[PDB]
Design an enzyme around this catalytic site. Structure first.
Site, PDB file in Angstrom:
ATOM      1  N   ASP A 156      -6.705  -2.924  -5.487  1.00 53.06           N
ATOM      2  CA  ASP A 156      -8.190  -2.687  -4.732  1.00 53.06           C
ATOM      3  C   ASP A 156      -9.260  -2.514  -5.769  1.00 53.06           C
ATOM      4  O   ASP A 156      -9.469  -2.218  -6.779  1.00 53.06           O
ATOM      5  CB  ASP A 156      -8.086  -1.332  -3.967  1.00 53.06           C
ATOM      6  N   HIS A 161     -12.395  -2.075  -3.713  1.00 50.58           N
ATOM      7  CA  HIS A 161     -13.417  -1.311  -2.880  1.00 50.58           C
ATOM      8  C   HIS A 161     -14.847  -1.381  -3.065  1.00 50.58           C
ATOM      9  O   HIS A 161     -15.427  -0.304  -2.910  1.00 50.58           O
ATOM     10  CB  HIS A 161     -12.880   0.338  -3.138  1.00 50.58           C
ATOM     11  N   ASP A 211      -8.797  -4.582   0.194  1.00 49.30           N
ATOM     12  CA  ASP A 211      -9.433  -3.362  -0.166  1.00 49.30           C
ATOM     13  C   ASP A 211     -10.741  -3.673  -1.062  1.00 49.30           C
ATOM     14  O   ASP A 211     -10.813  -3.192  -2.096  1.00 49.30           O
ATOM     15  CB  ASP A 211      -8.927  -2.265  -0.602  1.00 49.30           C
ATOM     16  N   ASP A 257     -15.107  -1.796   1.353  1.00 51.77           N
ATOM     17  CA  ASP A 257     -15.338  -0.327   1.810  1.00 51.77           C
ATOM     18  C   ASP A 257     -15.706   0.527   0.569  1.00 51.77           C
ATOM     19  O   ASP A 257     -14.670   0.316  -0.389  1.00 51.77           O
ATOM     20  CB  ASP A 257     -14.466   0.040   2.829  1.00 51.77           C
ATOM     21  N   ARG A 258     -16.287   1.629   0.944  1.00 49.20           N
ATOM     22  CA  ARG A 258     -16.350   2.715  -0.023  1.00 49.20           C
ATOM     23  C   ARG A 258     -16.928   2.110  -1.460  1.00 49.20           C
ATOM     24  O   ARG A 258     -16.090   2.379  -2.438  1.00 49.20           O
ATOM     25  CB  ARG A 258     -15.016   3.450  -0.102  1.00 49.20           C
ATOM     26  N   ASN A 266      -6.283  -2.967   4.732  1.00 50.76           N
ATOM     27  CA  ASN A 266      -6.711  -2.159   6.066  1.00 50.76           C
ATOM     28  C   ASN A 266      -8.052  -1.977   6.240  1.00 50.76           C
ATOM     29  O   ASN A 266      -8.266  -1.562   7.397  1.00 50.76           O
ATOM     30  CB  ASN A 266      -5.617  -0.709   5.883  1.00 50.76           C
ATOM     31  N   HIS A 267      -9.038  -2.233   5.205  1.00 52.43           N
ATOM     32  CA  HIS A 267     -10.412  -2.079   5.340  1.00 52.43           C
ATOM     33  C   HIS A 267     -10.855  -3.268   5.710  1.00 52.43           C
ATOM     34  O   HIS A 267     -12.264  -3.358   6.122  1.00 52.43           O
ATOM     35  CB  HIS A 267     -11.145  -1.603   3.996  1.00 52.43           C
ATOM     36  N   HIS A 277      -0.462  -5.765   0.730  1.00 56.73           N
ATOM     37  CA  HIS A 277      -1.358  -4.592   0.711  1.00 56.73           C
ATOM     38  C   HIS A 277      -0.717  -3.257   1.026  1.00 56.73           C
ATOM     39  O   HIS A 277      -0.472  -2.363   0.253  1.00 56.73           O
ATOM     40  CB  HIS A 277      -2.734  -4.769   1.616  1.00 56.73           C
ATOM     41  N   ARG A 320      -1.664   8.868   7.185  1.00 61.52           N
ATOM     42  CA  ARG A 320      -3.143   8.593   7.421  1.00 61.52           C
ATOM     43  C   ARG A 320      -3.342   8.258   9.037  1.00 61.52           C
ATOM     44  O   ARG A 320      -4.502   8.607   9.123  1.00 61.52           O
ATOM     45  CB  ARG A 320      -3.020   6.832   6.798  1.00 61.52           C
ATOM     46  N   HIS A 336      -2.203   0.212  -2.018  1.00 62.81           N
ATOM     47  CA  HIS A 336      -2.963   0.871  -1.335  1.00 62.81           C
ATOM     48  C   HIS A 336      -3.043   2.337  -1.441  1.00 62.81           C
ATOM     49  O   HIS A 336      -3.793   3.119  -0.853  1.00 62.81           O
ATOM     50  CB  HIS A 336      -1.964   0.934   0.161  1.00 62.81           C
TER      51      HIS A 336
HETATM   52 MN   LIG Z   1      -7.621   1.628  -0.011  1.00 64.96          MN
HETATM   53 MN   LIG Z   2      -5.578  -0.209   1.875  1.00 67.99          MN
END
Ligand SMILES: [Mn+2]
Ligand SMILES: [Mn+2]
Lengths: 56, 292, 196, 293
Positions: free
Chosen positions: D56, D58, D84, D87-88, D116-117, D166, D213, D240
């Site tokens: 990731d 991110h 990933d 995001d963030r 997933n993002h 992922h 989650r 992940h």
């Molecule tokens: Mn993540």
């Molecule tokens: Mn993820």
């Protein structure tokens, strides 16, 4: 249709004073067989013809 | 230090405590030099020793400087007529005059096994290395390691002076790979391998004392794994080819390897168990059982 | 503000450990500051420890340390001389181009690229050129484009005779493979050197 | 036509490598080209060794540049990102823009998967939509990125033995033939095989179980062994979960979690790692720390 002599002659990371560069192997890698079905094109449908004739 | 040990042992009338303390220190600090099979051939057998020396060294051995033998080695007339008798007539020395000849004997052992060489020359070279192993064996081992190189036109590691070689003896097993089909050179390499294994054991035992200014179990495991790897390499060398089985160089090399493995098993009965727990191909099973 | 000799002598008991540690920023700074010290401590100190240090840096895991050691070796071969490193650094670097890992091969290619502009053209014709010529049949697709870029870089350095004798046929052979990146790199090398 | 476009791509990459975003038309053309390129790729991208798989990001452009400085330059060595990277993060558009530029420029030298993002309901609640609205003024670059994220492949097959993805395993999936027969051109749902492939997590559970989650399941060691034995695989790479050393082995060296985002959310202060696989399938875990700004 469908061991250690070679590992010793190239060891010691070419330095003779440190460990190996990598950290091991996962499985085996570089699968030897990698064979594909390439027997023949002709004379293959005639076997199917003979089998269908027998079944008929 | 080995020449000094020998010349001190030769004087037993005087030098009472000096030689005793020197031997008691050699037996503890340098166990790789106290190998029995290294300096046991100098014992008397039947009195025939020195007889040919006193009877076959008057008319010769006077104009055979090392430069003559060196220039006789490397030349366009690669015929083995003169070099053979030259290297044969100097085998009657007292193992103390072969010090200037050691440098000529080394650096040419790799060129020796080029193609079409006789058997007596290799035997004489092996005998000369054996009689030169009783004195200055460390420098001789270093020179023989630096002489038996793969010679692949590229320099990877060179001259292996004292540190990169005594730390891992396995370097004596990554040689030109042509000596595998050579009984005398294989025996020389096996002697060097045993000596360097003992030297590595001593070096680790001394290094674990000059540190932290547990570790003993780690050193024991490292030594066991190193001995097991050496045994495995020696076993894999016994493989016939890469693709008569009784009358060939392979047979003699397998027998020498079995002898070294028997000596190692007699020295330590745990490395045999460790190797058997590690295992080796079955093609070597009828050879080790009937050879060791 | 401090003499070069003083700062080179004061950093001797520390360079034996700071040259190889966990972090790489300290190693990067040491490599960047070395060329100001190797030229003052003489030549015996170099062949004593600094050669081993640089040979160990050239095979590091990360790429920043590798390129820093490459630039440092370039600076050293520009400061000391050409014929001095012909038998001390060139053979050891060329002997590294036999490993199964592609990283070491790329490192040797980068070293050949960085040393082709300092070592003249006579040595890079029969000593370093045959290695780049023979490393063209590498099945690794990430080494063929590097070899093509190396040939493009050493193009203007070498004379037209060598570029027309063996470089042009090997480039024509490389331009007929199945990959697209190496093919584009080889076509660019051909169109920039006016060889085709 | 091709040389001028290649030079424009190099200029775009050099501009992105200096913390400089592109314009609306440039991002639109890049997303279009990535859409025409990724259409030929299947769900299980057949990646060939040697490679350097990451985890990731991110949306951390500085950490991405640190990774590139550590694990070799992008055009030199191969890369395999497992999602990933959107995001963030303060610099999230720059990271995904550089990644997609490297993908459209080095389609055979870099591979990126879907996480997933990479969706439309997650980017709106984590700041990516806010960043796209603030930087570019309008909300068209975000729309283009979310429309492109549907074309990203799901998993990757390295050397026919390593299976990178992922999320992780799925209860409704028993072989790779089911993964290859999935319609990835679809928004990530709340339930199904793709949701589990993008939201799974490993543990010592044994069997299955609902994940904390909110989506995806939680498999154990026996499930990983059954999946690796029924597909000829020897390892399952994933990214992940947040780790400390950077790489984590699970299920008797069957699952490898590789988190390559150092200082996650700028509050943990951990390290990161990537896995460099050589030609002989030899793995090396290269670790690093967040670069100082
Ligand atoms: Mn993540
Ligand atoms: Mn993820």
């Amino acid at each position: 249709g469908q061991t250690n002599r070679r590992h010793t002659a190239a060891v010691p990371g070419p330095g003779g004073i440190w460990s190996v560069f990598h950290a091991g192997v996962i499985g085996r890698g570089l699968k030897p067989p990698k064979f594909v079905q390439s027997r023949n094109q002709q004379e293959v449908i005639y076997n199917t013809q003979s089998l269908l004739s027998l079944l008929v | 230090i080995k020449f000094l040990i020998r010349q001190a042992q030769g004087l037993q009338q005087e030098l009472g405590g000096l030689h005793s303390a020197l031997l008691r220190l050699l037996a503890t600090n340098y166990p790789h030099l106290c190998i029995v099979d290294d300096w046991i051939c100098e014992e008397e057998i039947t009195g025939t020793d020195a007889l040919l020396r006193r009877m076959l060294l008057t008319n010769n051995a006077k104009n055979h400087s090392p430069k003559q033998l060196q220039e006789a080695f490397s030349a366009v007339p690669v015929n083995n007529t003169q070099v053979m008798q030259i290297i044969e007539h100097l085998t009657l020395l007292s193992a103390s005059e072969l010090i200037p000849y050691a440098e000529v004997l080394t650096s040419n052992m790799s060129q020796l096994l080029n193609s079409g060489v006789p058997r007596r020359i290799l035997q004489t070279v092996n005998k000369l290395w054996m009689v030169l192993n009783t004195v200055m064996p460390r420098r001789l081992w270093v020179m023989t390691v630096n002489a038996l190189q793969p010679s692949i036109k590229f320099v990877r590691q060179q001259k292996y002076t004292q540190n990169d070689l005594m730390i891992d003896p396995l370097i004596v097993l990554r040689c030109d790979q042509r000596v595998h089909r050579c009984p005398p050179l294989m025996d020389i390499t096996l002697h060097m391998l045993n000596g360097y294994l003992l030297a590595s054991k001593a070096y680790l035992s001394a290094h674990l004392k000059e540190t932290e200014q547990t570790r003993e179990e780690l050193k024991n495991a490292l030594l066991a794994a190193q001995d097991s790897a050496a045994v495995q390499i020696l076993l894999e060398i016994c493989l016939p080819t890469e693709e008569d089985n009784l009358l060939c160089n392979l047979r003699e090399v397998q027998c020498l390897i079995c002898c070294l493995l028997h000596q190692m098993y007699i020295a330590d009965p745990n490395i045999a168990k460790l190797v058997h727990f590690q295992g080796y191909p079955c093609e070597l099973l009828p050879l080790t059982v009937a050879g060791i | 503000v401090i003499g070069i000799r003083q700062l080179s002598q004061s950093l001797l008991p520390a360079i034996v450990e700071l040259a190889e540690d966990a972090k790489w920023r300290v190693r990067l700074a040491i490599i960047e500051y070395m060329p100001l010290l190797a030229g003052q401590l003489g030549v015996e100190f170099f062949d004593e420890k600094l050669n081993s240090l640089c040979m160990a840096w050239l095979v590091d895991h990360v790429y920043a340390i590798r390129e820093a050691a490459t630039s440092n070796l370039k600076k050293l071969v520009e400061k000391f001389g050409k014929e001095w490193a012909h038998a001390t650094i060139i053979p050891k670097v060329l002997a590294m181009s036999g490993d199964p890992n592609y990283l070491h091969r790329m490192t040797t290619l980068f070293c050949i690229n960085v040393l082709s502009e300092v070592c003249g053209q006579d040595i890079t014709t029969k000593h370093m050129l045959p290695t780049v010529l023979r490393m063209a049949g590498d099945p690794v697709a990430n080494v063929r484009f590097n070899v093509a870029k190396s040939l493009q870089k050493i193009g203007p350095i070498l004379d037209n005779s060598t570029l027309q004798s063996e470089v042009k046929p090997i480039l024509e052979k490389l331009t007929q493979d199945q990959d697209v990146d190496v093919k584009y790199f080889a076509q660019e090398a051909l169109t920039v050197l006016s060889l085709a | 036509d091709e040389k001028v476009f290649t030079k424009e791509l190099d200029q775009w990459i050099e501009q992105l490598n200096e913390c400089k975003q592109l314009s609306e038309s440039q991002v639109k053309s890049l997303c279009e080209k990535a859409k025409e390129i990724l259409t030929k790729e299947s769900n299980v991208q057949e990646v060939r060794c040697p490679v350097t798989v990451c985890g990731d990001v991110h949306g951390q452009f500085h950490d991405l540049m640190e990774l590139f400085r550590i694990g070799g330059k992008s055009p030199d060595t191969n890369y395999l990102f497992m999602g990933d990277y959107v995001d963030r993060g303060y610099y999230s558009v720059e990271t995904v823009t550089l990644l997609v530029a490297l993908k459209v420029r080095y389609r055979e030298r870099i591979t990126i998967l879907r996480g997933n993002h990479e969706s439309r309901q997650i980017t709106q609640v984590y700041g990516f939509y806010d960043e796209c609205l603030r930087k570019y003024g309008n909300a068209n670059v975000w729309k283009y990125f979310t429309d492109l994220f549907d074309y990203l492949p799901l998993t990757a097959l390295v050397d026919g033995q390593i299976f990178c993805l992922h999320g992780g395993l799925s209860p409704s999936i028993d072989t790779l033939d089911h993964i290859r027969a999935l319609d990835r051109l679809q928004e990530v749902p709340h339930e199904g095989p793709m949701c589990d492939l993008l939201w799974s997590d490993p543990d010592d559970r044994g069997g299955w179980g609902i994940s904390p989650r909110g989506a995806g399941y939680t498999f154990g060691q026996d499930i990983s062994e059954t999946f690796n034995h029924a597909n000829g695989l020897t390892l399952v790479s994933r990214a992940h979960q947040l780790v400390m050393e950077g790489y984590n082995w699970c299920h008797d060296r069957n699952v490898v979690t590789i988190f390559s985002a150092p200082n996650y959310c700028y509050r943990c202060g951990n390290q990161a790692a990537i896995m460099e696989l050589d030609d002989t399938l030899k793995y090396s875990f290269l670790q690093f720390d967040p670069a100082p700004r």
